[PDB]
Design a protein around this motif. Structure first.
Motif, PDB file in Angstrom:
ATOM      1  N   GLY F  64       0.809  -1.195   0.000  1.00  0.00           N
ATOM      2  CA  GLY F  64       0.000   0.000   0.000  1.00  0.00           C
ATOM      3  C   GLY F  64       0.846   1.249   0.000  1.00  0.00           C
ATOM      4  O   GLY F  64       2.070   1.182   0.084  1.00  0.00           O
ATOM      5  N   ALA F  65       0.187   2.399  -0.069  1.00  0.00           N
ATOM      6  CA  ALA F  65       0.885   3.667  -0.227  1.00  0.00           C
ATOM      7  C   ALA F  65       1.223   4.273   1.106  1.00  0.00           C
ATOM      8  O   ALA F  65       0.375   4.351   1.999  1.00  0.00           O
ATOM      9  CB  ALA F  65       0.050   4.637  -1.043  1.00  0.00           C
ATOM     10  N   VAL F  66       2.470   4.717   1.226  1.00  0.00           N
ATOM     11  CA  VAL F  66       2.927   5.427   2.419  1.00  0.00           C
ATOM     12  C   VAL F  66       2.095   6.686   2.717  1.00  0.00           C
ATOM     13  O   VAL F  66       1.759   6.940   3.864  1.00  0.00           O
ATOM     14  CB  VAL F  66       4.430   5.770   2.321  1.00  0.00           C
ATOM     15  CG1 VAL F  66       4.811   6.873   3.313  1.00  0.00           C
ATOM     16  CG2 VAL F  66       5.267   4.519   2.545  1.00  0.00           C
ATOM     17  N   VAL F 120       9.455   5.694  -0.468  1.00  0.00           N
ATOM     18  CA  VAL F 120       8.148   5.976  -1.077  1.00  0.00           C
ATOM     19  C   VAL F 120       8.150   5.737  -2.592  1.00  0.00           C
ATOM     20  O   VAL F 120       9.196   5.754  -3.259  1.00  0.00           O
ATOM     21  CB  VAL F 120       7.684   7.425  -0.835  1.00  0.00           C
ATOM     22  CG1 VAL F 120       7.667   7.735   0.654  1.00  0.00           C
ATOM     23  CG2 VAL F 120       8.593   8.383  -1.572  1.00  0.00           C
ATOM     24  N   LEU F 121       6.955   5.515  -3.120  1.00  0.00           N
ATOM     25  CA  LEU F 121       6.741   5.379  -4.543  1.00  0.00           C
ATOM     26  C   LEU F 121       5.793   6.482  -4.929  1.00  0.00           C
ATOM     27  O   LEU F 121       5.034   6.966  -4.095  1.00  0.00           O
ATOM     28  CB  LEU F 121       6.097   4.034  -4.853  1.00  0.00           C
ATOM     29  CG  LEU F 121       6.827   2.774  -4.400  1.00  0.00           C
ATOM     30  CD1 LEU F 121       5.927   1.568  -4.558  1.00  0.00           C
ATOM     31  CD2 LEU F 121       8.078   2.591  -5.201  1.00  0.00           C
TER      32      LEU F 121
HETATM   33 CA   LIG Z   1       4.459   4.619  -1.355  1.00  0.00          CA
END
Ligand SMILES: [Ca+2]
Ligand SMILES: [Ca+2]
Ligand SMILES: [Ca+2]
Ligand SMILES: [Ca+2]
Ligand SMILES: [Ca+2]
Ligand SMILES: [Ca+2]
Ligand SMILES: [Ca+2]
Ligand SMILES: [Ca+2]
Ligand SMILES: [Ca+2]
Ligand SMILES: [Ca+2]
Ligand SMILES: [Ca+2]
Ligand SMILES: [Ca+2]
Ligand SMILES: [Ca+2]
Ligand SMILES: [Ca+2]
Ligand SMILES: [Ca+2]
Ligand SMILES: [Ca+2]
Ligand SMILES: [Ca+2]
Ligand SMILES: [Ca+2]
Ligand SMILES: [Ca+2]
Ligand SMILES: [Ca+2]
Lengths: 192, 192, 186, 191, 187, 189, 193, 193, 185, 192
Positions: F64-66, F120-121
């Motif tokens: 999932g996203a940070v 992070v992405l």
């Molecule tokens: Ca991320």
């Protein structure tokens, strides 16, 4: 009977004399788009054909490729070392990692690009799905391919494999001047 | 089409889905493909039963023809975490992930029925990306693999190497063979 | 205070479940297999001594799924009476046949049909063999169970289920799959 | 799908409309006759029989299509339960629904003035090996014969006559359907 | 105890209006909703066979064959069914509006009423085409009969008017006989 | 006894809701906005019920996203109750941030838990000017993540930055050693 | 890309060839992409044509195939032994299992690869779905094709069938040097000799 | 995948050919892929053409088919018996049931296969959906076609119809040697010394 | 000698040179018009020599067959019809409509005749308009079959009511063909 | 859908697609979206014309409503590389990529027609991935952005900062404005 002229082949690959084929007559091969097996094998075949016509005249490989697989480029690279003619490489626009391998694998002194060309190298990409045992098998083979790419680049550029391994870890872009300095090309055909 | 049951509670009439009703008897169903969504529901059910009574057995009914071992991992851990003994019964199928849960029941409380099908195999996985990342994910896959072997060895009494060899490919066991293997303790034809 | 519905949360099937009637309908597949098994365990829990009534109307589905329902039937204490209301294709016919001695029935235009197990695998040769062996075992298990409940020889069952084998109600009594037909309820 | 609420000693109880009509021993058979809705209908009859095995059950039918094999289970259920099953065709009774309509209790089969009854031979199909094709073809011939026997039984017609009529889509006005023996009478207004 | 909502998604608004013997007939007239409306009338009759039922119609299309059932249901149940067109009555809805009880068929001032002949279709062998074409001709005849009956027009006049889409202003519809009167405001 | 019992939703009183009564929140599946706001909402409710009893956050999230985890993390420091974190199975990077950000001494995992952290992405598409704007904002989010892990583990920001450059798996023992968690439970204490 | 043409101008007139047909003139055939029935048959036709032209000059089979079915390759393998000309095989880039089979099946002493070629062998893949009886029938056939592959590899490499059966149980990658040592090829060419 | 071509030195000059069209010049026809109506009609056209060129020289049918419908194979089979030339048949790789029927239907003594060929025969497949009356009509036609296949195989192999019917009840694989013994083909073209 | 040669002239074009036309696949408008145009071309090359129509058609619409049939009767040359494999209803019409004494099949050919199919969707008035036209076409099919077979129209109508398969022998007996060839005569 | 022309060569009749025929007059069409496939086709045409006659002008007729500047870059370099002066005419539209080639024609030989639309704008791009990789591609995008400004500055005579400002957003120029700005030299209504 004379063969019909076209700039571009129709969706059917009609056996009409397209512009690339007319350049082949001057020993120019175009390597464009994604480097993948289909186009790769067509490029290998053009080199074999050019070598059959005259094994002593240079072959000119013009490169403009924004992407593609290093394993596909690998077969083209070997083809270039295999045939007798020196293979001159010129990057017209883009040379991504597959393409840059070939740019760099040109004959000594005969690798070039244009003033706004973009060269970029990075490590091999792969993938596998299945049983763990098989994942380990394919992983090792990917490590092997990755080492081969580093060795090839080390060889033609003059750099350490450790250095190349370090630089290719992530996308590494090179301006034309940086590419001369790195040893991926010999010179830039500057604006005259 | 989940059926409901209405019970007469001291406080009045209450509806239950069939599974909530059997939960009232400390029975948990673990069915279909073992994947995260159902894994977590099963875990939440175990923690709920532990909260209602920390001491009464939990009964985990298993009928799973497939699914990932990593998903089963959380459930297995939950089983050892919670205070209640977890009795395991395989009603029909228990493929690899399912077999892990079955075998990880409380000593002397692992069972199946006469036509149950039990099958164990090594972990599956896969990844796609840069070689460096492929190596990282291959190593983690190797570890999950070793974990699976350690867990089966521990609960079955077999050596890790023996388990590794047997799970190399899909390995089906009859109920009798599963008792002999140490995956379960006994078979019930009809209820004891 | 629970809502009343024919279909959806207190539906017509839950109302019949109070009378120890379970419906086994549609394709026999894992989801509906486990729900059926859950109702049997529920019914056993309420009263392990009164019969459970399994009404069957299933035109298909996988024998491996039916397998779990079958075993559950023999596992739970209560006698399971089986009635085929409409269709019993091969997985459904297994459950039909596997009801309690004397308590397996069908209606006069019921369609019973048996055939050998279906299967499939795809991959490496070695794994194909492994899975072909397990399919043969499942296939022998189906024969053995039908044999046990009908009184036929395993070989005879094997031969008859080689291809789709349809049985009229009368043929099914004669075969041993059910014990009697009902015109109207006795 | 509307809800009706009723007052009980123990509070308000809510019903969907059909559950409420069930309270009057009315069952709705509508849409395509296929297994899902067929079983629900059989379940309703078993329930009503359980509530009172002696009062009539009322089957209201509005079905423009569906499979005869699915109708077969409902037909048998109707002869199986102890209650008389009165049948009324509100709008449409296509082959599967016509089977059910005709299979109501003697003297208790009906339709409304603009109802459309239609009967036809069973449809089917199979794809596979020749040997398997012959097996399923025979079973199809058998189901087809059963349909004819059932219509012949409830109409008073001979099977050779039923077979002939059902060869292709055979529509009946309500009058023709009384005359055919598929129903017993037409209701102009509630009698 | 029972929960309250405006819309299904459980007592809802339509169920609440049902308690005042109001039934909504809205959207395309097709079998599913038709059968719901029929059940509602049966339920209302059951609750009280003597009080009027109120059918509020807002339908821009649908098949006459589905409407046929509702229409017969209206004449079958003991209660007078008063009909009111709040917005649209396309041909199937118009048949229902028109088949309300004498003196109890109405619309609002900007309602659009529209009648037309039955639509149909079949595909297959010629013999079957012929068979279904006759049945379609029968159904088409039944629509004309029903409309003639309730409007007071000759069957031939109805058949002519409905040969193509025929829109009627509220006034034109009173004059034609599909309805008895227009309401500006609730009387 | 009015309210109906179900194990799984799709309303009814479901098994998750029953664990909420014992101040247990499940954070499972992908970490993304929808479930993040539900988790934050549960925290506010638990705080409202008793400001001083612990909140237990059980984590099993493979990814999932940070950025979505960020909100949950801030909520956790914002509410008054101590938030105990336990990783039941997986704690991918967005999960691991939450695991590590639980109250001092109250962060745990089970013996076969898998913890993994990474940078992070993100991504953007459009004009160059805008690409630069979003790239700067990604750098900031990336720094915030290194800062948070540093704070809670005791590691240097430069060390966290290096370690999260690529996917970095930790065994439960390595995770205790790293400072992401305080202890491992073989069985309930 | 699209397929380049070669136009040979002549006093007689002028003729047009796609690049592959032009290389056919030099008795070179390309075996590229997934080995499957369509291209298999084109390759077999090309071998029959070259045999027709001259049954005594070598045919050159250049191989770059990263995968495909062994049953499709079998037809090509048999064609290779059937036609009179010796078939020289060179692996330009990739030879996965099916391609590896054709590579190894080249005439003795005339099998090669380039320095970064990748050779890989594995057991046959298969699959059936249907009645148990039919599953058994197709499983036996798969066992036979699997044995056939092993026998062919054993034949041309010098290895024991049991040795080959063990090696192909899972994907088995060979470097050019290992492929020579294994006996799948006879030598590696750095540059054209 | 793309069909190579050739240029030949003809009486009025040089003409191009796709590879298959060039092998047509040697009286070779390729029957490959799934047997179905489109390729079936091409093959028959090629046979009529070859007959027209020379009614007395053999036609050579090279077969590589893994599947397809016997009803499509029927037309090819009948065309083989219709045209004057003997039709020699050679299975290069695969001959599934429609292909096997054509293989077996070659001229006496002129049917062959290669050492790793796979020949397989089974009863006809069909299917229909519709009214019962129509199902009965189509099941009888299916039985007739089924009987025709048995009669054709029997004639050419010498077997009894009943034996053929029993053997094709399910998928029946034959090795080249069994195929010779069965009577489907006359000999195997074994790898020359 | 300039023009290239392929199997896929093309092969059918080369057979066109021997006055052979292939009618294969579903009979539908596209292929119908190509067949028709080939007959017109053959007539234009030589109005006197036979045209040979080889038929292998498992299905298709009778209304498309109609055009081919009229073309056949329109062009001066005799049209020989041979059914190589399949001739379902649309194809059977063309087979039966060949020149007298010049209609043939092969031993395992499958011939099959049936009534016209169709359909319409729209207003009642239009359904009736198209139903009547369908009846006309249905009658035209029967009259064509009666003319060429010798059977009564009433007999053809009854037989074509449902799919009616004929063996080569039955088709000779029926009048649909004149003879069966074992090998080229 | 592309029309043919048959010409009487000294060696007999030859068929040309309309574009190959215009190629005989040293006219190249650059039309539609600028992207690699058509870019490479136009570059080949320039290489071929140089090969035929390195001193005669090449005429580049432009009608492109859009496309990527990176693609145009290869064409622009090709134009500076080949020996012939490249005259550019905008027949209808030149969007930013097209505009770059229009402005990059030989000095004094850049033109458009009276209802032509010229429009310039900064490069677009994008990337998805890890933060480190985002920064890498962002730097490269900046570099390409600067290249575009430097090329337009060079050919127009404007300052780089002015060009950078003007291209911040879509910037449409009338023909007259384009003469004044220095993107072209003149406007033709009727050919001279
Ligand atoms: Ca991320
Ligand atoms: Ca790569
Ligand atoms: Ca070289
Ligand atoms: Ca425990
Ligand atoms: Ca796994
Ligand atoms: Ca029991
Ligand atoms: Ca039916
Ligand atoms: Ca009854
Ligand atoms: Ca009334
Ligand atoms: Ca209508
Ligand atoms: Ca009036
Ligand atoms: Ca806090
Ligand atoms: Ca050879
Ligand atoms: Ca294979
Ligand atoms: Ca012959
Ligand atoms: Ca067949
Ligand atoms: Ca037709
Ligand atoms: Ca004529
Ligand atoms: Ca220049
Ligand atoms: Ca751009």
């Amino acid at each position: 009977v004379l063969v019909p002229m076209v700039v571009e082949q129709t969706s059917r690959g009609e056996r009409a004399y397209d512009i690339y084929s007319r350049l082949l007559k001057d020993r120019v091969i175009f390597l464009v788009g994604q480097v993948e097996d289909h186009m790769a094998n067509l490029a290998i075949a053009q080199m074999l054909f050019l070598e059959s016509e005259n094994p002593n005249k240079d072959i000119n490989l013009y490169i403009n490729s924004p992407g593609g697989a290093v394993t596909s480029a690998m077969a083209i690279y070997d083809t270039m070392q295999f045939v007798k003619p020196d293979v001159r490489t010129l990057c017209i626009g883009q040379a991504a990692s597959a393409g840059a391998l070939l740019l760099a694998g040109g004959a000594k002194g005969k690798r070039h690009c244009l003033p706004h060309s973009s060269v970029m190298i990075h490590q091999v990409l792969g993938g596998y799905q299945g049983q763990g045992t098989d994942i380990q098998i394919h992983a090792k083979q990917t490590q092997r391919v990755s080492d081969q790419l580093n060795q090839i680049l080390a060889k033609h550029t003059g750099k350490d494999i450790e250095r190349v391994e370090k630089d290719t870890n992530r996308d590494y872009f090179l301006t034309p001047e940086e590419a001369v300095e790195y040893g991926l090309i010999d010179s830039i055909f500057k604006e005259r």
